[PDB]
Symmetry: D2
Subunit: 297 residues, 4 copies
Amino acid sequence: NAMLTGLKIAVIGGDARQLEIIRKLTEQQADIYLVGFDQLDHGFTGAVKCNIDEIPFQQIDSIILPVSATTGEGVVSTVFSNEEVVLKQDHLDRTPAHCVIFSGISNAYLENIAAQAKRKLVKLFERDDIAIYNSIPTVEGTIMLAIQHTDYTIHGSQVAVLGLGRTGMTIARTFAALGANVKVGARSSAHLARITEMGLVPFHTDELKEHVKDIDICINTIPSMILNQTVLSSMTPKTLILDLASRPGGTDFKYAEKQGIKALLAPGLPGIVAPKTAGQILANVLSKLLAEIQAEE
Amino acid sequence: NAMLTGLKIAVIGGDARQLEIIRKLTEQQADIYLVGFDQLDHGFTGAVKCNIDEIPFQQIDSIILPVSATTGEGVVSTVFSNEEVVLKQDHLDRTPAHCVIFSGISNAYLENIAAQAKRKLVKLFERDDIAIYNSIPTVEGTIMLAIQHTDYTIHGSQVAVLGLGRTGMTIARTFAALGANVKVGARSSAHLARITEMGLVPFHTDELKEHVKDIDICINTIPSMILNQTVLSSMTPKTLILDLASRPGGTDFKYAEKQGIKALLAPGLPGIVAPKTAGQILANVLSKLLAEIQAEE
Amino acid sequence: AMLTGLKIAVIGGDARQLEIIRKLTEQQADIYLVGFDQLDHGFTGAVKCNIDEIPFQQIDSIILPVSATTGEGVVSTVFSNEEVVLKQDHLDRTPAHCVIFSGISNAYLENIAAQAKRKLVKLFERDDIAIYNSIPTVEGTIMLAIQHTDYTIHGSQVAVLGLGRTGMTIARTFAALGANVKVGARSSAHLARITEMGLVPFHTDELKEHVKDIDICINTIPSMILNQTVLSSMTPKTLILDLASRPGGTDFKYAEKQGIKALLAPGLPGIVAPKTAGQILANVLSKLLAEIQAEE
Amino acid sequence: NAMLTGLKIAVIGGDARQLEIIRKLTEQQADIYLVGFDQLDHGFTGAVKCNIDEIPFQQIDSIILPVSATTGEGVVSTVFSNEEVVLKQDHLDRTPAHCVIFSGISNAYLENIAAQAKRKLVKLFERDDIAIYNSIPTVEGTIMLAIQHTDYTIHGSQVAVLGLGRTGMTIARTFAALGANVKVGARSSAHLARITEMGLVPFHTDELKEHVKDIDICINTIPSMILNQTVLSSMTPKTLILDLASRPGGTDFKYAEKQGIKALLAPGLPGIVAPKTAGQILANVLSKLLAEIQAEE
Ligand SMILES: NC(=O)c1ccc[n+]([C@@H]2O[C@H](COP(=O)([O-])OP(=O)(O)OC[C@H]3O[C@@H](n4cnc5c(N)ncnc54)[C@H](OP(=O)(O)O)[C@@H]3O)[C@@H](O)[C@H]2O)c1
Ligand SMILES: NC(=O)c1ccc[n+]([C@@H]2O[C@H](COP(=O)([O-])OP(=O)(O)OC[C@H]3O[C@@H](n4cnc5c(N)ncnc54)[C@H](OP(=O)(O)O)[C@@H]3O)[C@@H](O)[C@H]2O)c1
Ligand SMILES: NC(=O)c1ccc[n+]([C@@H]2O[C@H](COP(=O)([O-])OP(=O)(O)OC[C@H]3O[C@@H](n4cnc5c(N)ncnc54)[C@H](OP(=O)(O)O)[C@@H]3O)[C@@H](O)[C@H]2O)c1
Ligand SMILES: NC(=O)c1ccc[n+]([C@@H]2O[C@H](COP(=O)([O-])OP(=O)(O)OC[C@H]3O[C@@H](n4cnc5c(N)ncnc54)[C@H](OP(=O)(O)O)[C@@H]3O)[C@@H](O)[C@H]2O)c1
Ligand SMILES: [Cl-]
Ligand SMILES: [Cl-]
Ligand SMILES: [Cl-]
């Protein structure tokens, strides 16, 4: 019922997730340009496969890069093409004023050539809805890791979730629902109250030492050094640390290794564990945002 | 072990709720002056019953007032006293610099005489943690209200909760727990996304009309008149509206009435339904805040 | 699902029976309605008559109210100024396959049905009714819990006695409401189940030790266990909601002497949620009545 | 407090599971003869490692065998032994009257030589509480399988669980807690009601074909040919079938493979997925039962 006819999009690069986007945009009758897909028989009606120097940027209303957009040299990551794909300044200049670029995470090079071309760059992984929606595949990732790195059942174990942010809330809820005894560490009184209303056990992150002495699994959400040497000193090798924070994560890895503590940094859970879902999530937010651009012209 | 020894505090007036407050402060060995409690059948450890004119204000580190501090002319509300208790400007002036006045909701008279006295006034109900803790007693209230004004079972019914704010989140989780088919309406994309992670049905409040056409119970949270004449026009008399938003609520009651719709505004639900717990919440936050004041000197 | 070729007598009843008649007319059963003269709306394909005016020879089922009848055999109508008595001969004129449905147990009814060689189903005794009914019964228990305490169900200490049909529902619901629930049973399988549901299990032999410091004790066991020696550990702080059938599972006269509020709550579904209660009945009957029709 | 002090027990072969069992019995100060573990890197307090011919059976109060007790020729499975342990009739014959033998599942050889020795044989897996305790580690195994065999999230999918028996209950409950949309098929009036009170969608299995047309995941718990060719012909390749029932499950796996449908048989999930919990579950039941033998004598 909601359409995107009279828009012209370039999908440059991607993985299993971009397929969901492409699927979505063709359902919404956008005019689609595909670069980085020459190998795959996607089965996507109407879509036109070409290189980056054969895209008519003059007419392009939007560019959809992959989640981790570009390397140093600015090469776009493809998985369904052998030909290396590179995004240049010049490409973004040939582009209308109202043209918006979409990517997942930050990148000095992409922010550069976008500020330089005076074109808007939306960093999806920074919106709340994307983080929140993405917490779902990320719990499922976390559950998966815990199941396969322990000899015991999640149910009835002692589980700490560090931080009650957009994902922490989801991790703690789902772990509790799975039957674990879940405790949560936060700092704001608001988070501590919510924890208790959710029926969980709250501790302040100042007391992290005392509250992880004897826990079975410790899941970190805090994008900072919280699982410091002083705190790991109190832990036993009975504890699995699943650290979900963005690199360099939240835990003194060298020290843990020393103490015989398995501490895993697990970047990119959604893409790894549920690409159809991870993909549908971006596709849906993207279809909402593109629609707004279209209503204005 | 967390104590409150070197502390002078007046507790002036109160409900059943205040009984919990005194209880905690006296467990914590504070020095207390109780006015408005002559009619109470017992005492507390460390506190005297006296008059406002009897208290040594020059030394008081904190004053505690009822949820609803004062009525115009300075009268403090008392449930446990025959004698009318009036708080004067002169009282607060006699007070040292660091002294904190605690209350619940806003009140013109109190704010005046306090700012005038150059003394800090903390209205506890504007804090997030209070609001979040209180949402629990308030669902219980709302559950109560739903059981009595319906001849059907909450379980398996259609319930809308409007708003995923501090309390709305608790109302939604709880009616879901209890077996209703809960949809929740909100405006922000993060709310919309969280409503889905919690396994509920989200809608945008711009669709309010369409999503309340056929529901059994519509619990409102939003401080704005969203249940307006035009939304109600296509609701049926079969709907119960339970309005928890503060005066003036969220609904065109007058119209609902004509339409044959039971819409009920339900203020101060924590106070009515679980006075002990309502009181225990205030006490617990009050404790924390006084430990801070005690730490400055 | 149609009861097209089925003659059914509904005799006496309350709001709930109306619900059944509704559903049974929806399915185009031929209904005979006795003890409903004081009612002013009718029912499609239903004839209001006297008990002595029904062709019992052709009735395939007979439906009585929840509390079947008195010792003298008079059915409890709410919808008639006139007194209706069910006799042995009514049931003898009835065909071999005719089923009498009622709710609870009754000596007179069991006797006349047995002497008539006629199947008497007591619905409140069947698992599904017990289970469907457990829902409106928690809500009732919740209700009582809310109005009889000054504290919140959330974060309280709750004990539920018996993981039977209703107790199962009573525990999951209270736990989901954020109460700390522990449940006493006796069989190992019940204790396993309690453990899986994430709740704290104890054995009813340990009952004195496990109810010292609870806030609400909810009872489901139809046998005396909240007794004088147990009760003597508990303190007036504790609230007992005994849901078991009369006499209950509590030494109430003792709870009295100790100052413990202990309530007997019979017939919660009918009180808390009459529309639902009647639908539960209605729906099972319709499922059951089709089974009868499936043979002839 | 519950001690097994005056008791002589032989533990003959077994898994990592048996370690938890031994750990428990030794903690209860039983006297243990441990055969099948020469190759374990540590020992236990109060138990000697030995050979079956070294066991003083004439005094053994009880013999504890592996989950799958024994082969046809009488060999006992040992994962911690080079040497081949074989259990003879003569061994049970030497044993005293009250002596009880414990094993996991059924098996003829054992069954036979017990009966012929006139000695009590308890098969643990046939117990209600074992079955239910094990359901927990088994859902987690199932969750794992779901996660590893799909490219989408469990949250928000269509899940069908077949049967509400001892494990079906746990399975249906836990996938629902994961945020799936769970329907469950049973046949008793009583199970159907239970399902509905559980807040899930019930159906009768007579209707299976109808209800699995659009499911993402189908979990069978029924030890009968239910997921048959005629049912399977309605399904689409998109569906994943997890068959948890004992070999040969409830599926036409040969038809399912032809139709392009992945269907898995997943035997002994507790053992694979959480051996510590499997073991502990077994020990706590064993401990409780050996206490009955001790009381009797
Ligand atoms: N592994 C993956 O595939 C994956 C998936 C999703 C997210 N992530 C990463 O995981 C991290 C989690 O962030 P998020 O998306 O959940 O959003 P978020 O809302 O920012 O989560 C961070 C939370 O941690 C709290 N926090 C920060 N410092 C703290 C401290 N010292 N003590 C106690 N609490 C503290 C913050 O609360 P306050 O307001 O109290 O400071 C904030 O609520 C991010 O770095 C994100 O990139 C990774
Ligand atoms: N009687 C009682 O038992 C009692 C007890 C506690 C609270 N209350 C009342 O309940 C209300 C709820 O407040 P709270 O403390 O729960 O938290 P809150 O944060 O104040 O909740 C309000 C929520 O409504 C949303 N909202 C506001 N205006 C909207 C609009 N015009 N359309 C759609 N959504 C809108 C907001 O979302 P955005 O952030 O997107 O704006 C916000 O999340 C307050 O009025 C409070 O006075 C009553
Ligand atoms: N007043 C109302 O509104 C209301 C509503 C519904 C039901 N009820 C009544 O409340 C009772 C509830 O029974 P129900 O329908 O839930 O089904 P139920 O299956 O009878 O529940 C009873 C459970 O209690 C257990 N039990 C009996 N004696 C025990 C003992 N001495 N120690 C430990 N456990 C014991 C049984 O377990 P075992 O397997 O160990 O024997 C059984 O599982 C019935 O009497 C019913 O009439 C009242
Ligand atoms: N792979 C593993 O790790 C693992 C783990 C545990 C169990 N299992 C296997 O899975 C099966 C599960 O049984 P369980 O332990 O969960 O206990 P169970 O109580 O016997 O489960 C079977 C349930 O299915 C229902 N049922 C039986 N036949 C049916 C049919 N034809 N149509 C519809 N429903 C039917 C039964 O209800 P009714 O009363 O109507 O007959 C019963 O409640 C067992 O065979 C077991 O060996 C495997
Ligand atoms: Cl704060
Ligand atoms: Cl927004
Ligand atoms: Cl038993």
